Amino acid sequence: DRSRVFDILSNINIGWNLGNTLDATGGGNSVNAETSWGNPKTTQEIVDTVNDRGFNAIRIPVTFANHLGPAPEYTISADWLARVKEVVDYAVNDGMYIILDTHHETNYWLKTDPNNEAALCEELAAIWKQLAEAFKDYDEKLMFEGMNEPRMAGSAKEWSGGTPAERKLINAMNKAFIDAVRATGGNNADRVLIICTYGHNSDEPTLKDLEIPSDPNIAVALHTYTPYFFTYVADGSYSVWNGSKKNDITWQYNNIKKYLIDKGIPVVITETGAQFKENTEDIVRWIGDYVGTLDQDGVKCFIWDNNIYHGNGEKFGLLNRSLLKWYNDDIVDAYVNHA
Numbered sequence: 001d002r003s004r005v006f007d008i009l010s011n012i013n014i015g016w017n018l019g020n021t022l023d024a025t026g027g028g029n030s031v032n033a034e035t036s037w038g039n040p041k042t043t044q045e046i047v048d049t050v051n052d053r054g055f056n057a058i059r060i061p062v063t064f065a066n067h068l069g070p071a072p073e074y075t076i077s078a079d080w081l082a083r084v085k086e087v088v089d090y091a092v093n094d095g096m097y098i099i100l101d102t103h104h105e106t107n108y109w110l111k112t113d114p115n116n117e118a119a120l121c122e123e124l125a126a127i128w129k130q131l132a133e134a135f136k137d138y139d140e141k142l143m144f145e146g147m148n149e150p151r152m153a154g155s156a157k158e159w160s161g162g163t164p165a166e167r168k169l170i171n172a173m174n175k176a177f178i179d180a181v182r183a184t185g186g187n188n189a190d191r192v193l194i195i196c197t198y199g200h201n202s203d204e205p206t207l208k209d210l211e212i213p214s215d216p217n218i219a220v221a222l223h224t225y226t227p228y229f230f231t232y233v234a235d236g237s238y239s240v241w242n243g244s245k246k247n248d249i250t251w252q253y254n255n256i257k258k259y260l261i262d263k264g265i266p267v268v269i270t271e272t273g274a275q276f277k278e279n280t281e282d283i284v285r286w287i288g289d290y291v292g293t294l295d296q297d298g299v300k301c302f303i304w305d306n307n308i309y310h311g312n313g314e315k316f317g318l319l320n321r322s323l324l325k326w327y328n329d330d331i332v333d334a335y336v337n338h339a
């Protein structure tokens, strides 16, 4: 029975990622990392704005690598941990649901080499031990997500679920994460812990090899910017949504039902969204087909938002953080009013 997790998740309307912020990897071992990718320092006001609009759940991606001491302690620099707590505290002050993760560790130490299983498991656990300790008293609305898109950068199957050997390693790393957090006790004994697949990939071979922990207070995170060629800019990509490609979403979703939902396993889409391609009416139609598919079984999602809309980059921005106004209210309405 995993129904405690379903109840907590059912309270979520829809989620929102504080992208390109604490996950940013500039600034070295300094709090300035937060602003290194061009975003302003996060404020209570910014989180309020997100909450007020209808995003009552927030994902806080964080890259710790450059703020860690040497092995084996990997002590998180006091200043950084304090700042991460401040930003989490903004959401807590608004009674929001929260995901805290480790993010671009994949740029540094989190390279999924099966020959290096021990060093990977131990660093992950050492980091999560310190995080769990820091947030020991935080209530059940705070959730932990162990890893973000864990993979080997540059490998052939980086974005197609990796190799079968790597998928075993991900299962070991999931257990290490869970094991480390539960051992801190307090509210972490039954806190919702979100595990993931290799690269957060949701292909059938990826899901088939996913080992499910017996721990009843866990959920499976996936990333589904589906279809890729609508959501991202690339050779072959498009900005029109008429519903002819809805089959891609449904076909993928049926596999998720096959391997997780219909086995009573809680599932969360911790990242999704569509880059703005001057196609407001199309994105609104995609949201209806994509989010409406998730709503069939009450699966929740968190929208990726990096604060990029006008300038260069992946245009996942929705909230203009400097003005506290939304870049595109038609798209945002479709999200918050999905039910």
Ligand SMILES: OC[C@H]1O[C@@H](O)[C@H](O)[C@@H](O)[C@@H]1O
Pocket: 149, 159, 199, 200, 201, 223, 224, 225, 228
């Ligand atoms: O896992 C989700 C992802 O889909 C991939 O196809 C993209 O190349 C990645 O940039 C993205 O993070």
Ligand SMILES: [Mg+2]
Pocket: 186, 187, 189
């Ligand atoms: Mg308790």
